[PDB]
Amino acid sequence: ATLNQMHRLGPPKRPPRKLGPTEGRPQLKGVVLCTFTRK
């Protein structure tokens, strides 16, 4: 892009990092509902 275009866009807006199954936490407490096996 041109300098005018880079100035007009500004710095690249980095998308906020997604949160995995733990929702950004190291561990979670849980209560077992059922047990089974997966292929």
Partner 1 sequence: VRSSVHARWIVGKVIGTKMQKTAKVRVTRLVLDPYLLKYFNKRKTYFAHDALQQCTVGDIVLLRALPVPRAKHVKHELAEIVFKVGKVIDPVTGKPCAGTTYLESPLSSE
**Quick one: which of 30, 11, 15 has its CA closest to 1?**
11
Determine, following the binding rule CB under 7 A, whether residue 22 of this chain makes contact with RNA: no
Closest CA to 28 of 36, 39, 19: 19
Angstrom distance (rounded) from CA 5 to CA 11:
11
Cβ 14 to partner 1 shortest distance, Å: 15
Site string for partner 1, 2-21 (x = CB under 8 A): -xx-xx---x----------
When asked if residue 38 is in the footprint of RNA (CB under 7 A), the reply is: no
Which positions lie near partner 1, rule CB under 8 A?
A: 3-4, 6-7, 11
